[PDB]
């Protein structure tokens, strides 16, 4: 309620509760958080630019090709991480309002 801006709007009521009777040894009570946010875009955003910083210049790469890997694979790992950061950014702040194909049928015309 006080943090409506921090939830995605087309998954309703974004919480999984669960309660155990038994606390961790040496704590009278505790809770565990597992949160799934768009915010993780940040990880894949930083790592895929640092990765293009490397493979764009074949830097550090002779050590790995030198074990039987190929340049196609660096491209496919990259292709996918860039695709992946584009999927998390597609859903970063994605509407509960309809998405796309906004075209229509007209009015009847004199003959």
């Amino acid at each position: 309620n006080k943090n409506s801006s921090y939830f995605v709007e087309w998954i309703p009521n974004n919480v999984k509760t669960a309660v155990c009777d038994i606390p961790p040894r040496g704590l009278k009570m505790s809770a565990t958080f597992i949160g799934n946010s768009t915010a993780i875009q940040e990880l894949f955003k930083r790592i895929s630019e640092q990765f293009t910083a490397m493979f764009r210049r074949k830097a550090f790469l002779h050590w790995y090709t030198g074990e039987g890997m190929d340049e196609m694979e660096f491209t496919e790992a990259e292709s996918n991480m860039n695709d992946l950061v584009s999927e998390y950014q597609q859903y970063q702040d994605a509407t509960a309002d309809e998405q796309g194909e906004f075209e229509e049928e007209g009015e009847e015309d004199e003959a």
């Binding site: 790992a77 990259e78 292709s79 996918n80 860039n82 950061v85 584009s86 999927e87 309809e98």
Partner: protein
């Protein structure tokens, strides 16, 4: 070199409803039979020849 990927497209099918019949009982019957016919029962024949 062209650097890899960077392209997805949304997993999205818009929602609608089709052939949802308005089958409520609100006008569910029309049949009728009258509460009997009109008759006379109050009068004698007085048939004294």
């Amino acid at each position: 070199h062209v650097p890899g990927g960077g392209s997805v497209q949304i997993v999205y099918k818009p929602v609608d409803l089709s052939k949802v019949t308005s089958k409520c009982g609100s006008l569910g019957n029309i049949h009728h039979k009258p509460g009997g016919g009109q008759v006379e029962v109050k009068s004698e024949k007085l048939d004294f020849k």
